[PDB]
Amino acid sequence: CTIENFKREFFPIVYLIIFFVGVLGNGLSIYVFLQPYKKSTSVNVFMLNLAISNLLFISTLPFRADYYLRGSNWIFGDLACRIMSYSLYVNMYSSIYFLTVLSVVRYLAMVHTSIRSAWILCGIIWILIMASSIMLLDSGSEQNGSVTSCLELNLYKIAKLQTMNYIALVVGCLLPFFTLSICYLLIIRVLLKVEADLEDNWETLNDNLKVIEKADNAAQVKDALTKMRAAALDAQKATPSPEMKDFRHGFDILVGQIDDALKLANEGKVKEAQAAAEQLKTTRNAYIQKYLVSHRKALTTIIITLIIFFLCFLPYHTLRTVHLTTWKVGLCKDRLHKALVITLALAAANACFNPLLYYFAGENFK
């Protein structure tokens, strides 16, 4: 209608922006991932597969942009038109599954070879999405006079797409969204548990160390040290790997330094004990810094994935469903269709948004 003028103004800009930004980001990311120097992890296998999928998709965007810059004329042949749709949807649902499986893996890593397991999972995802999407290859370039069209909805496609939507809405969108959400809510829950317990024990340690600093005799210092050691042994038990070994070691040597101070408290030597207490405080602060940095990174990756997933996909799937259920052959539903165009652009922008995850979760080590 006049939706077409908006499409021909809007799609070229956003597609070219996604293309250049995404080539840059995904190229840097894949270059980093394929280097044999750094030790390979499973999350890197998932991120590599995701970057490769997004880059394959991004390579088709110049053709989409060309199509609209020509006033919605397709010049690239019937096979390329088929590949357009195939690559769009293969990328989209492979990306959703890569993110979701990465999330399940992280949750299980907190609760509970894995490199080969990640490669097998990614191969399964590739095969699933590519096999289940093959009927998109039946849709080709349609021609009306002198204007070969592509990328459009039409009656020839509708009967398929409508049903093909719902299944894809349930299995490719809502299921992974729910899985992602539940895994990350459970992770937030375990993090809040450990942080609450750690603050609780922190408070007892601060109180009894303040008592030790404000020392009156050898009995009160020993009493405060006994309380401290009790609180510290509670924390060591409720601790639930490089980061996990450092924490257990810190807890053990903290209990050791408290036993050192208690030895001094039996001898009635008050000054020695207070010096030991000060050095124990230094140790505790070191351990807390090391934990807090890890905590912040762990939450940042989770929230970024929820934001990207949410905003890129759920508006687009919602509006795509609504647009398909109301579609009439002759009716112009300009405003809804325009909304769908905007959210389709957001969904395509995922291929250049994902390198943020590669930023934060990727190089976070040291």
Ligand X SMILES: CCCCCCCC/C=C\CCCCCCCC(=O)OC[C@H](O)CO
Ligand Y SMILES: O=C(O)CCCN1C[C@@H](C(=O)O)Oc2c(NC(=O)c3ccc(OCCCCOc4cccc(F)c4F)cc3F)cccc21
- The identity of residue 105, as a single letter, is V
Give the residue from 54, 25, 179 showing the smallest Cα distance to 106: 179
> Rounded to 5 degrees, what are φ and ψ at 100?
-65, -45
The residue assigned the tokens 């840097």 is 28
Nearer to ligand OLA, 7 or 64 (CB): 64
User: 49-88: which residues touch ligand OLA (CB under 6 A)?
Assistant: 59, 62-63, 66
8 A C-beta contact, residue 140 and residue 85: no
Q: Which two tokens stand for residue 310?
A: 């949410």
CA distance 329 to 193: 56
Interaction of residue 344 with ligand Y, rule CB under 6 A? yes
* Positions in 287-346 near ligand X (CB under 6 A): 318, 322, 326, 331-333, 335-336, 342, 345-346
- Residue 82 as a binder of ligand X (CB under 6 A): the answer is no
Residue 315 to residue 173: CA distance in whole angstroms:
11
> Which amino acid is it at 164?
M
* Structure tokens given for 349: 């922008």
Partner in contact with 66, chosen from ligand X, ligand Y, ligand OLA, none, beta carbon below 5 to 8 Å by kind: ligand OLA
Which of the 8 DSSP states describes residue 358?
A: I
Choose the contact partner of 336 out of ligand X, ligand OLA, ligand Y, none; CB within 5 to 8 A by kind. Answer: ligand X
- As a whole number of angstroms, the distance between CA 277 and CA 169 comes to 60
Rounded to whole angstroms, the Cα distance separating 179 from 241 reads 26
Q: Does 4 bind ligand X (CB under 6 A)?
A: no
State which of residues 323, 343, 347, 349 lies at the interface with ligand Y (CB under 6 A). 323
**What would the x/- binding string for ligand Y be over residues 124 to 153, using CB under 6 A?**
----xx--xx--x--------------xxx
Q: In whole angstroms, how close is the CB of 68 to ligand Y at the nearest point?
A: 9
Residues 6 or more apart from 138 whose CB is under 8 A from it? 82
User: Nearer Cβ to ligand X, position 271 or 329?
Assistant: 329
Nearest to 356 by CA among 28, 98, 49, 31: 28
The footprint of ligand X (CB under 6 A) covers 6, 8-10, 12-14, 16-18, 20-21, 24-25, 28-29, 32, 52-53, 55-57, 59-60, 63, 76-77, 80, 83, 87, 90-91, 94, 318, 322, 326, 331-333, 335-336, 342, 345-346, 349, 352-353, 355-356, 358-359, 362-363
The footprint of ligand Y (CB under 6 A) covers 7, 85, 89, 93, 128-129, 132-133, 136, 151-153, 161, 164-165, 168, 171-172, 320, 323-324, 340-341, 344
The footprint of ligand OLA (CB under 6 A) covers 23, 59, 62-63, 66
